[PDB]
């Protein structure tokens, strides 16, 4: 996209992560499993939802009966109705089409920006500790057990902590 | 041989397409219709009020009495009229209806 | 339209391995954008939610951490059912159990949330 | 890890009136992945509201949740007899995927 993650340098995604939008994959000693990030995946959720509903309710209209009848000596004023009738066919058609069309490219744009920045925030805490083997994987120089893993996930990644064990790995 | 943590995004059976800017027919995971192609083939009751069905007559014969739609059952009230494509029981002596569209105008509801 | 029928032993003796099995009427247990689950009800322990199994073009399962080595949730695609094991079984495992599905990320959006349970079968262990 | 708290523990109010009841999480809670369940009497659970303020499936309109991060909260506006019942919130995270409340009882009594 115009990000370039999703469809970019992570090729496909995960049918496996089933939490939500967002998330990481690992493996370590103690197992392995999908686990979605749901700090990015509810602010994506929140936004889409006021987009929908912003499109859907900034449209509100009063009664109105467009049916005008028009004898045989008002054509005149009866094209005239239906200039005004198909003048507002034109309208609302050209609108709607292509308002969702531009939506849907800022949409998929939205998220590509999301798992790109899920990516940065990720690769800015482990800075050389870990290797980025790209396709949007760290491979980690040093030992990281499920505590470490809900860590990084969390934010919370201590570098000082193992950057002792990661100095002498990357020889 | 070590410790790995990878990055990605969700995907699922979804056969949805969407248009874009740039590209037709785009799979997405998830989506939502703005556009109603849907309705139920009845003539409902509009604002709670149903609406007033003149059968083989038009308006002209229901106002004036036209011998076919003495059996119309007149109600107090009604939202919209009915008629129908085949409703040619109106003015059964030929004459002219002076000013019978704006009437038509002021009976709709 | 869709429907759960638990069945399983009653009573354990306080050493062995707890069995229940859920059979699944009007949708599939091997189904997408659903999953199956496992939750108990202990007076003494509330509402446990115990694991989940579901299948996306492979079979997943996901326990609880308290646990986490002692149950296993085996699906069975021939008979649309998938049923609990939980081993060395004590008498803190006596409870209600309940299978129940998932149903995240339908409209309005997201929101993992348990919308069919099954009856329940007490399962009391004692000596 | 994530810790939901109900209060009150009882709650003790007639037919008809008006009830507030409250969850109070140990950390932030996604606002999508938080639900409310019922469970009458001799009946096993029920879904009553998810994402904190979406009513399920044959609902009736007395029940409208909120909240929001810490606090979430069950409004009921108008209690009828079959509403006696107890109440348990559910929340979901990526690190102790689902953890309940122990419940709110709804003893309609005086």
């Known amino acids: 996209g115009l990000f370039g993650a999703i469809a970019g340098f992570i090729e496909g995604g995960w049918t496996g992560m089933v939490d939500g939008w967002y998330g990481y994959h690992h493996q370590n000693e103690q197992g392995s499993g999908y686990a979605a990030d749901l700090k990015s995946t509810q602010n994506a959720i929140d936004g889409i939802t006021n987009k929908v509903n912003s499109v859907i309710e900034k449209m509100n209209t009063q009664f109105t009966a467009v049916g005008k009848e028009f004898n045989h000596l008002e054509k005149r004023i009866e094209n005239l109705n239906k200039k005004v009738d198909d003048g507002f066919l034109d309208i609302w058609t050209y609108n709607a089409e292509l308002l969702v069309l531009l939506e849907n490219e800022r949409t998929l744009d939205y998220h590509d920006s999301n798992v790109k920045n899920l990516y940065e925030k990720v690769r800015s805490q482990l800075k050389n500790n870990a290797k980025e083997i790209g396709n949007g994987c760290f491979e980690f120089y040093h030992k990281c057990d499920n505590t470490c893993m809900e860590s990084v996930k969390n934010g919370t990644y201590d570098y000082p902590k193992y950057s002792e064990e990661a100095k002498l790995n990357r020889e | 041989p070590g410790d790995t943590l990878c990055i990605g995004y969700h995907a699922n059976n979804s056969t949805d397409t969407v248009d874009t800017v740039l590209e037709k027919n785009v799979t997405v995971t998830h989506s939502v219709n703005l556009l109603e192609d849907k309705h139920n083939g009845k003539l409902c009751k509009l604002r709670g009020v149903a609406p007033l069905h003149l059968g083989k007559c038009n308006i002209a014969g229901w106002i004036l009495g036209n011998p076919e739609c003495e059996s119309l059952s007149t109600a107090s009230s009604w939202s919209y009229i009915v008629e129908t494509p085949s409703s040619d029981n109106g003015t059964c002596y030929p004459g002219d209806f002076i000013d019978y569209e704006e009437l038509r105008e002021q009976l709709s509801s | 339209q869709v429907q759960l029928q638990q069945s399983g032993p009653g009573l354990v003796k306080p050493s062995q391995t707890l069995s229940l099995t859920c059979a699944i009427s009007?949708?599939?247990?091997?189904?997408?954008?659903?999953?199956w689950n496992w939750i108990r009800q202990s007076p003494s322990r509330g509402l446990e939610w115990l694991g989940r199994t579901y299948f996306r073009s492979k079979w997943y399962t996901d326990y609880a951490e308290s646990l986490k080595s002692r149950m296993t949730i085996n699906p069975d695609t021939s008979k649309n059912e998938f049923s609990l094991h939980l081993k060395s079984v004590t008498s803190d495992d006596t409870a209600v159990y309940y299978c129940?599905?998932?149903?995240?990320?339908?409209?309005?959006?997201?929101?993992?949330?348990?919308?069919?349970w099954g009856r329940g079968t007490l399962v009391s262990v004692s000596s | 890890e994530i810790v939901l708290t109900q209060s009150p523990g009882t709650l003790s109010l007639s037919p008809g009136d008006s009830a507030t009841l409250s969850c109070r999480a140990s950390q932030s809670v996604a606002s999508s992945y938080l639900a409310w369940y019922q469970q009458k009497p001799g009946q096993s659970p029920r879904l009553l509201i998810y994402?904190?303020?979406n009513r399920a499936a044959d609902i009736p309109d007395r029940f409208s949740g909120s909240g929001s991060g810490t606090d979430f909260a069950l409004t009921i506006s108008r209690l009828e007899p079959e509403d006696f019942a107890v109440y348990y919130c559910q929340q979901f995270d990526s690190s102790s995927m689902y953890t309940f409340g122990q419940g709110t009882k709804l003893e309609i009594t005086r």
């Open positions: 009007g949708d599939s247990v091997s189904s997408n954008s659903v999953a």
């Open positions: 994402a904190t303020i």
């Open positions: 129940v599905r998932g149903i995240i990320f339908n409209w309005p959006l997201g929101g993992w949330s348990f919308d069919l």
